[PDB]
Amino acid sequence: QFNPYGDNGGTILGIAGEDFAVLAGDTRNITDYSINSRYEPKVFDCGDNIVMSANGFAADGDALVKRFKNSVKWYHFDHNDKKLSINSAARNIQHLLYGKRF
Amino acid sequence: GYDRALSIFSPDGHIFQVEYALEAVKRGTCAVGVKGKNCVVLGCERRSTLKLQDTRITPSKVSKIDSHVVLSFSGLNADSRILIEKARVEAQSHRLTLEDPVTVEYLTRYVAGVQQRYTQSGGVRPFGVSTLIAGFDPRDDEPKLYQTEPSGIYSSWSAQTIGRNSKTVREFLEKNYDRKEPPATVEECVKLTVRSLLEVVQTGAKNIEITVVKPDSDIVALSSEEINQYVTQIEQEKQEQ
Amino acid sequence: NSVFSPDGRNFQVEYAVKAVENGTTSIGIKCNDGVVFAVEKLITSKLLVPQKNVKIQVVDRHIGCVYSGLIPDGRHLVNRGREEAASFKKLYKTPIPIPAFADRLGQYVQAHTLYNSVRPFGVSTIFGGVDKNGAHLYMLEPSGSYWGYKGAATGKGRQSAKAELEKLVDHHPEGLSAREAVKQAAKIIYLAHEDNKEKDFELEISWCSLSETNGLHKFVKGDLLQEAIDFAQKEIN
């Protein structure tokens, strides 16, 4: 049967400091025992001083990052260019994910 | 389907269909509501096109919505059924999800909501019905009386009347209802209700009917004879030069 | 619209025609291996970017469309035309024959004279191209009616343009060349501007020729446009 999922490897790491935060990841993308790319970045600047990484199934990761970037864009349109705070992003992301609970 | 707009504005800013609905209300038989100290009383009349009727089976004007709230109306009888049915369903649905019977105010807001909605929907006309809704909130003893009209507006009244010649009876009640000293008893409250009805109806023959609502789902209708005891004791009493 | 008047005619369609008669003049010329389309573009203001308000539209890769009347109505029609062309290609693999394309617009336009809830189209549309067996030129009226033409004109200067075309047809029984019809279209557009000349105009020409464009719709730019504008200027002095 058709399996809609894959695993592209891939590890990400977030550390928060007093007046800064870092989000890091490896740049390797894999399938089973093969290397697809040695430099495929998966940590993204999404605007509003937010960085994001969705690790695991790369196709799903990309779809999610795309939609959050669009979410940020429409937040600006709908809310008078307001800066999307990190907590507000977090919540908005819960909803993105939970929309696909099934 | 059909959704041609019927309720629309005129150049002076009036919605004529809503307006003519009020005309149908002022066309219907009278209804009066007066709240006492520990009660609320509703009162109606009946017309005279014919009088070979069977009154065991003909719909009374006071309707039970839930065991603790009643609704009376002036206007088109047919329209009123549709509001009564909907109100009754909502009352059950409120118990089912809130685990509490409706407050009188909530039920009113619902019925007024339904009426309002029929003022701004394609291919429907407003209800030619205005209602008085009265009772007591669950586990509460302060009396409640409200009125809705075809526009969807609602509000609470110490006393109020609707329908034909309600102009007259509101005149009476405005002189005779003292905010300070509500009609303190069940008895003296039915008194004011019959008086206010008298000058509109004629005889209290097969026309004047009364309903009393007390706290905790206590609602009783009167008999022709118990009404007559107020008819007799007011006509002869308040006649002296 | 779904209303016949007592003479058998359709008064809403009749009025649509008035909107068309009121529009810019546009023409079509069939030639021995293709078609040529041309149109008058009124210069409302010096502020119009020249060449940058294109009126002629392509359908698929081989059909040209130009129209007079309510421009938005024309654009609506071409959009429908393009779905009609894709639907045909998708199912039948071959690109759509011009006669077939004519009936597709014909039927759609005609549909808008059937119901009282819609208005007819405020355009007459001239269109055509090269298909598997030859060049075809068509004109379609707001009523849905269309026919094949040797030459066609619609708009404010349609009478003077129709007269010019009649001259060409009668004086060229052996057929005209693609190169020639381009210049003649330029002449004819200049000679329909006479009946619309309170404003200045920009000339726009396209063509579809088996030898000159490989049977694909293409715009007449640069040298060949300038050569035509010259030929037209010459035969007015």
């Binding site: - | - | 119901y115 809830s117 819609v118």
Partner: protein
């Protein structure tokens, strides 16, 4: 695209009339006269085959139609309306009855179903009433023979004998004089042929007259043998030849 008249085109006027239904009845008045006569062992429906030019083939026009093997119809008013009512009536005899009960409907019920279709055109949005009046002649095991009239309103009523259309007033009278509850079929055919002679202006022969009977079962009109418990249809269209033979002895 889409329907934009979702309101009734037949409405009550101040006097209480439904205008569009009346106007449909006026349309029926101009219609070519048709009639039905009920015998003790049959029913006859008949009308005139008004030709327009003798180049037209009158046989190709069915004015008298079979609805079921035992039921038939004829009309006055608008031919095209009748034709679509016939097709709906046949289909509904199947969808509402045969596919449920494995037998054809009795006459009153099919008549009821036609009436329903006509009534709905009296009340649905975006339509005019049907401009026909029908005479429906049928037989069923539990009701025997019957004749019904259905009008644009959807009203229907049973008749012993009647006529509708152009010469209806005159012919209803002619029948009143001639109808008794003891008539054999051949007698009703004869009376129908007589009544129809008053209407027609031009030629009066078997090619200008359409006439059908509901009588006995015709086994030879069945198409198959070997199931003794159906003896065929009771509906028969009289042939051009058969009409003429009853005309020479008229």
């Amino acid at each position: 695209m889409t329907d934009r008249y979702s309101f009734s085109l037949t409405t009550f006027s101040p006097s209480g009339k439904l205008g569009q239904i009346d106007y449909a009845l006026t349309a029926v008045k101009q219609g070519v006269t048709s009639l039905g006569i009920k015998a003790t062992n049959g029913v006859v429906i008949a009308t005139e085959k008004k030709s327009s030019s003798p180049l037209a083939m009158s046989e190709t026009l069915s004015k008298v139609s079979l609805l079921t093997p035992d039921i038939g119809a004829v009309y006055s008013g608008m031919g095209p309306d009748y034709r679509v009512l016939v097709d709906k009536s046949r289909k509904v005899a199947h969808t509402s009855y045969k596919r449920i009960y494995g037998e054809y409907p009795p006459t009153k019920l099919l008549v009821s179903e036609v009436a329903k279709i006509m009534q709905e055109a009296t009340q649905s949005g975006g339509v005019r009433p049907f401009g026909v009046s029908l005479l429906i002649a049928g037989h069923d095991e539990f009701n025997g023979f019957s004749l019904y009239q259905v009008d644009p309103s959807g009203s229907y009523f049973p008749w012993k004998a009647t006529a509708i259309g152009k010469g209806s007033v005159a012919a209803k009278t002619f029948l009143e004089k001639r109808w008794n509850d003891e008539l054999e079929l051949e007698d009703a055919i004869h009376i129908a042929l007589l009544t129809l002679k008053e209407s027609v202006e031009g030629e009066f022969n078997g090619d200008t007259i359409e006439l059908a009977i509901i009588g006995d079962e015709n086994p030879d009109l069945l198409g198959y043998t070997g199931i003794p418990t159906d003896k065929g249809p009771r509906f028969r269209k009289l042939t051009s030849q058969e009409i003429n033979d009853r005309l020479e002895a008229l």
